[PDB]
Amino acid sequence: LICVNENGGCEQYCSDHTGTKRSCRCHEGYSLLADGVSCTPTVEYPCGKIPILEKRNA
Amino acid sequence: IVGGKVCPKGECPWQVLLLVNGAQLCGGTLINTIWVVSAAHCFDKIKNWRNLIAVLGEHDLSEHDGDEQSRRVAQVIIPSTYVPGTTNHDIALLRLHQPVVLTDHVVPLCLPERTFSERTLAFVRFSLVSGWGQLLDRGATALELMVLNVPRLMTQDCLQQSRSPNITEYMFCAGYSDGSKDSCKGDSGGPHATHYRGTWYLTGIVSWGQGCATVGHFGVYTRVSQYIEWLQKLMRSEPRPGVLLRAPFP
Ligand SMILES: Nc1ccc2[nH]c(-c3cnn(-c4cccc(CNC(=O)Nc5ccccc5)c4)c3O)cc2n1
Ligand SMILES: [Ca+2]
Ligand SMILES: [Cl-]
Ligand SMILES: [Cl-]
Ligand SMILES: [Cl-]
Numbered sequence A: 001l002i003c004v005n006e007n008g009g010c011e012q013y014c015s016d017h018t019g020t021k022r023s024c025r026c027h028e029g030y031s032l033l034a035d036g037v038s039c040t041p042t043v044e045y046p047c048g049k050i051p052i053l054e055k056r057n058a
Numbered sequence B: 001i002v003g004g005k006v007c008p009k010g011e012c013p014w015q016v017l018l019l020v021n022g023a024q025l026c027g028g029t030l031i032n033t034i035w036v037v038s039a040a041h042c043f044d045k046i047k048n049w050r051n052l053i054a055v056l057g058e059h060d061l062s063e064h065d066g067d068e069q070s071r072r073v074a075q076v077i078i079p080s081t082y083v084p085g086t087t088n089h090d091i092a093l094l095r096l097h098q099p100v101v102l103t104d105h106v107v108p109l110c111l112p113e114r115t116f117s118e119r120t121l122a123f124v125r126f127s128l129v130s131g132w133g134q135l136l137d138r139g140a141t142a143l144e145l146m147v148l149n150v151p152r153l154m155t156q157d158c159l160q161q162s163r164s165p166n167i168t169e170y171m172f173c174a175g176y177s178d179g180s181k182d183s184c185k186g187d188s189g190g191p192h193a194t195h196y197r198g199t200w201y202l203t204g205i206v207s208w209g210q211g212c213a214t215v216g217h218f219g220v221y222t223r224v225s226q227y228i229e230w231l232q233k234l235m236r237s238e239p240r241p242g243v244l245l246r247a248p249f250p
Helices: A051-056 B114-119 B155-161 B224-235
Strands: A013-017 A021-025 A030-032 A039-041 B015-020 B023-030 B035-038 B052-056 B069-079 B092-096 B126-131 B146-153 B171-174 B191-196 B199-206 B219-223 B244-247
Touching: A013 B114, B015 B035, B023 B052, B023 B191, B023 B199, B035 B199, B035 B224, B069 B224, B092 B224, B114 B224, B126 B199, B146 B155, B155 B171, B199 B224, B219 B224
Parallel strands: B069 B244
Antiparallel strands: A013 A021, A030 A039, B015 B023, B015 B052, B023 B035, B035 B092, B052 B069, B069 B092, B126 B146, B126 B191, B146 B171, B171 B219, B191 B199, B199 B219
């Protein structure tokens, strides 16, 4: 997988590595799940999320 | 904002209102608890730097509802390459004197990685622009925070579709050419925010031009992706005396 295509499958940030290697990363206030692509919040108020809406669907 | 709608209270929680001597100056974007991104030109004519205020959690300017948080601006950082009274490199980084407290009504927008922004975000068609700007060209400003969905155009396409402002690599086009929908005077410095897979990111800053919602012309926004590294480095830096700081770019 490559970052330039489909975001490398990453929910957030993507890094290409030597080989057929790819590493996904997450913004501060998020952690990467074991799927190696998904980001989940680790804090109450992560960036780029709208609480009243997040709650609205919680 | 011309031809938009009211942003429901709390749905634009990264939006900043900048005041000078209690008067509306510009918009801004919260990206961390102490950092705000705005537009350089907002500060062209600033006489007394000590009376600059940033307000978070603002919605309706006519009332106080207690969700509002005001902070003095401790630093205004602009790129070396910016020339007052122009549009190129129309970006500013503001350091708040004290952090804002994150709440349901106060949340930062994610500043993306450059690569991510360039490779992915840049291809998301529609993004949101917001502010308390003029509701009309030559009109009165908004009392309630307004928001507008605008589509992004590749610069080549923009130029073709347009009928002046020079579009640099440090800019991009977004909006409509039918004169119905645009950002406007009073909105400058506000966010152009882009959604991707459940999260919102900063992709643009409302710059400026002559008039708003001018037929045959699109909105031109500061291309934030060009500035990520510049911003990041600054955010890691210790404060310096004196409000205004010109910092080399790149
Ligand atoms: N479609 C749109 C979209 C967004 C828009 N924003 C504006 C606009 C106009 N004036 N300001 C403004 C705000 C806050 C401080 C200032 C002071 N700066 C200087 O006076 N510089 C300056 C320097 C040298 C010469 C002349 C001017 C200027 C604006 O944001 C028009 C517009 N149109
Ligand atoms: Ca209010
Ligand atoms: Cl303060
Ligand atoms: Cl330093
Ligand atoms: Cl000073």
